[PDB]
RNA sequence: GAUGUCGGCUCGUCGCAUCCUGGGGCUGAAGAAGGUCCCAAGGGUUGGGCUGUUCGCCCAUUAAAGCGGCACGCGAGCUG
RNA sequence: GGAUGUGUCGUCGCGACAGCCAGGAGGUUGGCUUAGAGCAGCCACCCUUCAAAGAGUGCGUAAUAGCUCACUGGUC
């Protein structure tokens, strides 16, 4: 889990998910788990 | 472009999608006021080397050619436009832009084709037959070759304006 | 087919820059034997199309 | 958007108030929804209409359409998730109706089903979670899987069917 | 980068854009949207970075030479006059001033170079396209 | 017509950018032992040599020997 | 700075699009650089068969392979 103020795509599997007031990104590649919180 | 109102108070223009402009030649200098979208779609095509029908509110079709366009800063949206009524034999000097067709024999070798001057003004465009574009042979160029205005084929019935030895296009060296 | 071209035109290696300095130049006759030896490896369908197949290889090689 | 809805004789849709009661041979199941979201059985099949066509209504449209289909299929045939026990020394027994874990841990982990869910062993090396409510069936089976998450080197623990779990490997 | 010879000192004042144009000496350009001070060093930042993304070409123009010397605080105190003659050069830049412009490359190849050379800048910028024909 | 100055001793309390204890994500995480990040201030956070020292170095250990504030806390409380 | 959070105006183009079943090149192991083939970097990005498969997207190995996409058909 990498907390980055600037969460952007890195491949063709990164999917931005808007949950409970938070910016998350799910992806087959676990190293691509970016989250602003 | 169905031109309509033409006052001096833009109060009935700025909030809405309208753009101020003026057309003249010599005899008549009536201020106008065309539409925003109408112009931002026409000018994209004919630019300043193509005339378009300008019918004022009431039934007055007046042929004119875009001259100079001031651009609002900080925004791409224009704010003022100048038109020039077409005379019929000799009217004004029109600027014609230079394009490029065919791959050069310099782009492959390693160099890259760079146009020194994009817009090239000429003398006596001749109404009814205004060159909307200009195709220049670039393939004959290699490494360091300079193609001035004295090498560009004429539209026909038109003359150059800039120095005959003014480099229009040049292939620069790599890196 | 590259090995055959390097023996026909007498190419030692090739060309790092086929855009500036090429290698050599051959004739269509040498192409005939190439499409005649590597038939099982070629689809191409009669005549020229096989002939134009090899041309594409020599073009990006320096011939 | 979703409009087709499979309705068969064995079910019983009751759009009474806010509580949409549904009866069946497998057992009666209750599924509550919204009031503004119109829904009824038109003729033979069932249709779910929506007042307004933006998002606040469409998001609930498919929502209800699916949940109702889940209650139907649940009272018609029923849901049964089939797990699997893969690894060395990994096995599971049964105590009356509660599933008994035994996977690497010193002490066996006892897992007791809630009210309406029942476990089944075919095998020492397979698990089968059966139930009525499609939500409960998953909610329960899940807990089972949480016990031992497939490790990225051998893929042990509990999985579905075949799970696709690629091995990272030591080495 | 730095001037070859000047007076030395200056002042400070920010009015609207004057001599900035939408397009020249190329096809694509990059324009600021906020007034600020663009340090010399920041320009090297942009130029070098765009040269990493462009192996060959050299079609990168920078017509915003810094012509504005700035003072600096040497240590402490305030019992003195002009302090720090030689610090850094800054080139003023107003919304609608073109800083950078490239050509020869495609569309994608240009959206990257300006992008990158945009994060270094103290201000926001946007990349534009042709359709301007004022004076020439 | 006065807001006693450094350090120490004494007595505490608070914040979280957590030194060690707990609960997680990822790993170039096999295991063990670590790295990094996120959550979390309940409690703990040793004894000595040199120096006024604050620091810091060193000895011997420890899960750990945290970083700041409170007038660089505290002299109508003590040392000087 | 970042994001399928919404409301309201605009600019490009399209039996789709997403999904699902099936297919995926033969030239080729392109030429070249190196201890050494869609995917380190130089260069190109040509031809053929076809209702059709771009010498090419990502992950991967010391290269290999393999898993897929762009492109085609079918079922709603
Ligand atoms: Mg006093
Ligand atoms: Mg915290
Ligand atoms: Mg370990
Ligand atoms: Mg002591
Ligand atoms: Mg004090």
User: In sequence order, what DSSP letters do the residues of E42-103 get, joined into one string?
Assistant: HHHHHHHHHHHH-SS---EEE------EE----SS---SSS--S-SEEEEEE-TT-EEEEE-
Nearest CA-CA distance, residue C4 and chain B, Å: 27
CA–CA distances in Å: residue B159 to residues B47, B93, B152, C14: 21, 10, 11, 51
Name chain A's partners: 3 or more CB pairs within 8 A: none
CATH of the domain at E116: 3.90.1170.10
End-to-end CA distance of chain E: 27
Q: HSE-up of E102 (CA within 13 Å, CB side)? A: 24
Q: Per DSSP, which regions of chain B are E strands?
A: 18-24, 31-35, 52-56, 60-71, 78-85, 95-97, 112-115, 119-123, 146-147, 159-160, 169-172
Q: Distance between CA B74 and CA E34 in Å, rounded?
A: 9
The burial of E76, by beta-carbon neighbours within 10 Å (0-12 exposed, 13-18 middle, 19 or more buried), is given as: exposed
Q: What is the DSSP letter of B101?
A: B
Closest CA to E54 of E117, E118, E124: E117
Residue C22: strand, helix, or coil: coil
CA–CA distance from D105 to each of B157, D145, E50 (Å)? 96, 15, 58
Backbone angles phi, psi at E92, to 5 degrees: -60, 150
DSSP states of C27-50 as a string?
A: -THHHHHHHHHS-TT----STHHH
Token pair for E135 = 């004076």
Let me know if residue E13 belongs to a domain. no
Q: Is E56 touching B (CB cutoff 8 A)?
A: yes
Instruction: Copy the structure tokens of residue B43.
Output: 């000018």
**Distances from the Cα of A14 to the Cαs of A6, A7, B83, E98, E109, in angstroms?**
14, 10, 52, 35, 23
D141 lies in the same domain as D72: no
Which of the listed residues D54, D78, D102 is the one where a domain comes to its end?
D78
A32 is in an annotated binding site: yes
The answer to whether the CB atoms of E17 and B74 lie below 8 A apart is yes
Give the up-direction half-sphere exposure of residue B141: CA atoms within 13 A in the CB hemisphere.
30
Of B97, B117, B175, the CB nearest to E56: B175
Domain boundary among D56, D78, D100: D78
User: What pairs with residue B60 in β-bridges?
Assistant: B56
B66-70 contacts, C-beta under 8 A, 24 or more apart: B67/B92, B68/E134, B69/B43, B69/E133, B69/E134, B70/E134
User: What is the spatial distance, in angstroms and rounded to an integer, between the CA atom of A37 and the C1' atom of F41?
Assistant: 21
Give whole-number Cα distances, E23 to C22, E108, E116, E127, in Å: 39, 18, 20, 11
Alpha-helix residue ranges (DSSP H) falling in chain D: 58-76, 134-146
The domain that holds D45 is classified in CATH as: 3.90.930.12
Q: Give pairs for E108-116: CB < 8 Å, separation 24+.
A: E109/E53, E109/E54, E110/E28, E112/E53, E113/E49, E113/E50, E113/E53, E113/E54, E114/E28, E114/E30, E116/E49, E116/E50, E116/E53
Instruction: Based on the fold, state whether residues D45 and D129 are members of the same structural domain.
Output: no
- Decide if E47 is inside a domain: yes
Residue carrying structure tokens 């071209």: C5
Only one residue has tokens 């310099």, namely: B106
d(CA B156, CA D42): 76
- 10 Å Cβ neighbour count for D131? 24
Tokens encoding E52: 């990493």
Q: Provide the CA D45 to C1' G73 distance, Å, integer.
A: 34
Residue A29, SS3 per DSSP: coil
**Which contiguous run of DSSP H or E holds residue D95?**
strand D91-95
Largest CA distance in chain D: 64
**What's the number of domains chain D is made of?**
2
Nearest partner of D65 among D139, D13, D130, D118, judged by Cα: D13
CA angle D114, D117, D120 (to 5 degrees): 120
Domain C-terminal end among D52, D78, D104: D78
Tell me how long chain B is. 175
Q: Is residue E120 part of a domain?
A: yes
Amino acid C60 CA to nucleotide G30 C1' distance, rounded Å: 7
- Residue E11 inside a domain? The answer is no
Question: D169 CA to middle of ligand 3, Å?
Answer: 15
Q: Are strands E36-39 and D110-111 parallel, antiparallel or unpaired?
A: unpaired
3-class DSSP state of B114: strand
Establish if B142 touches chain C: CB-CB under 8 angstroms: no
Taking the domains of chain B in order of start, what are their residue ranges?
1-86, 87-175
E16 touches chain B (CB under 8 A): yes
Q: Which residues contact D106 (CB under 8 A, 6 or more apart)?
A: none
Estimate in Å the CA B110 to C1' G69 gap, whole number: 33
Note the CATH number of domain B87-175. Answer: 2.170.120.20
Show Cβ contacts of residue C7 under 8 Å, excluding neighbours closer than 6 positions. none
Secondary structure of residue D145 in the 3-state scheme: helix
The H or E element spanning position B46 is helix B36-46
In order of A17, A23, D51, the CA distances from D56 in angstroms are 18, 21, 10
Coil, strand or helix: which one is D131?
Answer: strand
Q: How many Cα atoms within 13 Å fall on the side-chain side of residue E90?
A: 21
Distance A36 CA to ligand 2 centre (A): 15
Alpha carbons E50 and D97: distance in angstroms, whole number: 69
Q: Tell me the two tokens of residue D40.
A: 């009824």
> Does the structural domain B1-86 have CATH classification 2.60.40.10?
no
Q: Does E58 touch chain B (CB under 8 A)?
A: yes
The residues pairing with B68 across neighbouring beta strands, listed in sequence order, are none
Kindly provide the resolution of this structure in angstroms, with one decimal: 3.5
Q: What residues make up the domain containing C51?
A: 1-63
CA distance D148 to B30: 85
Question: What is the C-alpha separation between B69 and A5, in angstroms, rounded?
Answer: 43
8 A C-beta contact, residue C22 and residue C63: yes
Strand G contacted by C37 CB (< 7 A): no
Examine the domain organization and report whether D65 and D27 are in the same domain.
yes
CB of E43 within 8 A of CB of E62? yes
Structural domain tally of chain C?
A: 1
Flag if E57 and B119 touch (Cβ within 8 Å): no
Residue of B nearest to C19 (CA): B109
Q: Within a domain: residue E1?
A: no
Q: Does B173 touch chain C (CB under 8 A)?
A: no
Report the 10 Å Cβ neighbour count for E84: 12
**Residue that has been written with the tokens 């790599």 in this structure:** B174
Q: Which residues of C touch B109 (CB under 8 A)?
A: 19-20
Q: Dihedral, CA atoms, B154, B159, B162, B164, nearest 10 degrees? A: 70
Could you count the other beta carbons within 10 Å of the beta carbon of residue B169? 23
Strand ordering across the sheet containing B159-160: B95-97, B119-123, B159-160
Q: Which nucleotides of G are covered by protein (CB under 7 A)?
A: 1-7, 10-11, 26-28, 30-33, 41-44, 46-49, 55, 57-59
Quickly tell me which residue has 């050619």 as its tokens.
B65
Task: State the Cα torsion C11-C16-C18-C19 to the nearest 10°.
Answer: -150
Whether any strand G atom is under 7 angstroms from the Cβ of C49: the reply reads: yes
Residues D42 and D98 in one domain: no
Give the whole-angstrom CA distance, residue D143 versus residue D137: 10
The token pair at C37 is 């030896």
Q: Coil, strand or helix: which one is D146?
A: helix
In whole angstroms, how large is the CA radius of gyration of chain C?
A: 12
Q: Kindly report the backbone phi and psi dihedral angles of residue B163, in degrees, each rounded to the nearest multiple of 5, phi listed first.
A: -55, 130
Structural domain containing residue D105: 79-171
- Give the gap in angstroms from C-alpha C5 to the nearest C-alpha of chain B: 24
Cβ(E91)–Cβ(E58) below 8 Å? no
| Helix, strand, coil share (%) of chain B residues, nearest 5 | 10, 35, 55
| Dist. CA B137–CA B99, nearest whole Å | 10
To the question of whether residue A10 is assigned a binding role by annotation, the answer is no
CATH number at residue C7: 1.10.10.250
Same domain, D129 and D88: yes
Structure method: X-ray
- End-to-end CA, chain A: 10
Q: Do D134 and D161 fall into the same domain?
A: yes
D87 and D164 housed in the same domain: yes
Residue E96: domain span? 18-136
Determine the residue among B109, B111, B173, B175 to mutate to test chain C binding: the one whose Cβ has the most chain C Cβ atoms within 10 Å: B109
Q: Which residues pair with E31 in a beta bridge?
A: E98, E126
**C-alpha D84 to ligand 3 mean position (Å):** 27
Find the residue in B nearest to C22 (Cα).
Answer: B109
For B76, other C-beta atoms within 10 Å of its C-beta total 15
């Amino acid at each position: 889990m990498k907390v980055r103020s600037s969460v952007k795509k890195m491949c063709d599997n990164c999917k931005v998910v808007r949950r409970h007031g938070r910016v998350l990104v799910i992806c087959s590649n676990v190293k691509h788990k970016q989250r602003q919180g | 472009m169905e031109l309509t109102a033409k006052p001096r108070t833009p109060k009935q223009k700025l909030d809405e999608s309208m753009i101020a402009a003026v057309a003249y030649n010599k005899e008549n200098n009536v201020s106008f006021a065309l539409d925003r979208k109408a112009f931002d779609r026409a000018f994209r095509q004919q630019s300043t080397t193509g005339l378009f029908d300008i019918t004022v509110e009431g039934g007055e079709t007046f042929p004119a050619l875009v001259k100079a366009v001031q651009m609002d800063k900080r925004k791409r949206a224009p704010i003022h436009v100048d038109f020039y009524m077409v005379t019929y034999g000799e009217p004004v000097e029109v600027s014609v832009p230079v394009h490029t067709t065919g791959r050069s024999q310099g782009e492959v070798q390693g160099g890259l084709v760079d146009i020194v001057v994009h817009n090239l003004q000429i003398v006596a465009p001749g109404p009814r037959r205004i060159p909307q574009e200009l195709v220049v042979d670039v393939t004959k160029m290699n490494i360091g070759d300079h193609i001035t205005a004295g090498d560009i084929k004429l539209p026909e019935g038109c003359t150059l304006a800039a120095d005959p030895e003014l480099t229009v296009v040049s292939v620069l060296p790599p890196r | 087919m590259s090995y055959l071209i390097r023996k026909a035109a007498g190419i030692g290696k090739g060309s790092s820059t086929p855009n500036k300095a090429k290698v050599g130049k051959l004739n269509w006759d040498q192409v005939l034997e190439i499409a005649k030896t590597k038939m099982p490896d070629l689809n191409a369908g009669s005549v020229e199309a096989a002939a134009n197949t090899v041309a594409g290889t020599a073009r990006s090689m320096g011939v | 958007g979703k409009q087709p809805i499979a309705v068969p004789s064995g079910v019983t849709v009751n759009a009474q108030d806010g509580v949409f009661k549904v009866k069946g041979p497998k057992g009666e199941l209750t599924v509550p929804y919204n009031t503004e979201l119109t829904v009824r059985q038109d003729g033979d099949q069932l249709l779910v209409e929506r007042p307004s066509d933006a998002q606040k209504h469409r998001a609930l449209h498919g929502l209800t359409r699916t949940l109702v289909a889940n209650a139907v299929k649940g009272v018609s045939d029923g849901y049964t998730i089939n797990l699997e026990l893969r690894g060395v020394g990994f096995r599971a027994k049964l105590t009356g109706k509660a599933l008994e874990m035994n996977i690497g841990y010193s002490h066996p982990v006892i897992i007791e089903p809630p009210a309406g869910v029942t476990f089944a062993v075919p095998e020492p090396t397979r698990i089968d979670v059966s139930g009525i409510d499609k939500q409960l069936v998953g909610q329960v089976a899940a807990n089972v899987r949480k016990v031992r998450k497939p490790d990225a080197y051998h893929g042990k623990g509990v999985r579905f069917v075949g799970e696709q779990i690629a091995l990272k490997a030591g080495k | 980068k730095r001037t070859k010879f000047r007076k030395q000192f200056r002042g400070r004042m920010t009015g609207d854009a004057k001599g900035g144009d939408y397009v020249a000496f190329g096809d694509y350009g990059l324009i600021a949207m906020e007034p600020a001070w663009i340090k010399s060093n920041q320009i090297e930042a942009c130029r070098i970075v765009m040269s990493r993304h462009f192996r060959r070409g050299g079609k990168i123009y920078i017509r915003i030479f810094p012509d504005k010397p700035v003072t600096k605080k040497p240590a402490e105190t305030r019992m003195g006059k002009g302090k720090g003659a030689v610090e850094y050069w800054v080139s003023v830049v107003k919304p609608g001033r073109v800083m950078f412009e490239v050509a020869g490359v495609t569309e994608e190849q240009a959206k990257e170079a300006f992008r990158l050379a945009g994060h270094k800048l103290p201000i926001q910028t946007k990349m534009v396209k042709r359709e301007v024909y004022d004076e020439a």
